[PDB]
Amino acid sequence: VVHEDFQVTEEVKALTAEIVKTIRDIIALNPLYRESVLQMMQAGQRVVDNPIYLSDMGAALT
Amino acid sequence: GAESHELQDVLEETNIPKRLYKALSLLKKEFELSKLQQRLGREVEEKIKQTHRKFLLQEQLK
Structure with missing residues (x-):
């Protein structure tokens, strides 16, 4: 498992914000799964301690 | 960004x-980054464009 992370984390999660916005847009335009997960997990809620797995589940909708 | x-x-x-010059430098850096990202996206999208139109016609049939 490779999870290399830069020491300074200022722009790293900006791509995560863009990706979650894109996923929300895609499900809004072409719904694929219930939004309940979206309410449960929020990037700002901080309860996601595995952002790579978040990207994985987001790309799973594809 | x-x-x-x-x-x-x-x-x-x-x-x-x-x-003002620092702001111009930041704008130059961000424009360079955006152009590089767009160029990489264009190259990868063309590499996928290698996927021939027969695929699209078969998808139409599907």
Whole structure:
């Protein structure tokens, strides 16, 4: 498992914000799964301690 | 899309010309980054465009 992370984390999660916005847009335009997960997990809620797995589940909708 | 520290450093600048040139430098950096990202996206999208139109016609049939 490779999870290399830069020491300074200022722009790293900006791509995560863009990706979650894109996923929300895609499900809004072409719904694929219930939004309940979206309410449960929020990037700002901080309860996601595995952002790579978040990207994985987001790309799973594809 | 400049970092928070970039904005803070711009604020640290006192002289108007110095902060203006720093802002122009930041804009140059961000424009270069956006152009590089768009070029990489175009190259990868063309590599996928190697996927021939027979695939699209078969998808139409599907």
